[PDB]
């Protein structure tokens, strides 16, 4: 599908509210495999299961390994911009 930019608002006491799979070491993108009900990703409205996360706050994730992506994603705070695509 089209590449989308999506805004997420997170409070400091919460996580993003997603599960991710994949990573470069597996030859597949960082993919959203779960959107947890009521948590920030669900609330933002624009992120969905099956979306590939291409970037977050301008950081490219298309070539990141799984645990690299976890570190980068978990570091983001507040108003967080995602670049995503549903294939």
């Amino acid at each position: 599908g089209p590449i989308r930019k999506v805004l997420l608002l997170k409070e400091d006491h919460e996580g993003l509210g997603i599960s991710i799979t994949g990573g470069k070491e597996h030859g597949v993108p960082i993919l959203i495999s779960e959107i947890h009900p009521g948590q920030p990703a669900d609330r933002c409205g624009g992120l969905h299961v099956g979306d590939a996360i291409l970037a977050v706050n301008g950081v490219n994730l298309r070539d990141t390994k799984h645990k690299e992506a976890v570190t980068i994603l978990s570091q983001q705070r507040g108003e967080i911009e995602f670049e995503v695509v549903y294939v």
Binding site: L16, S19, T21, H26, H36, V70, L73, S74
Partner: peptide, 7 residues
């Protein structure tokens, strides 16, 4: 085969 992380 593929890892999953909750974040």
């Amino acid at each position: 085969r593929l890892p999953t992380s909750i974040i």
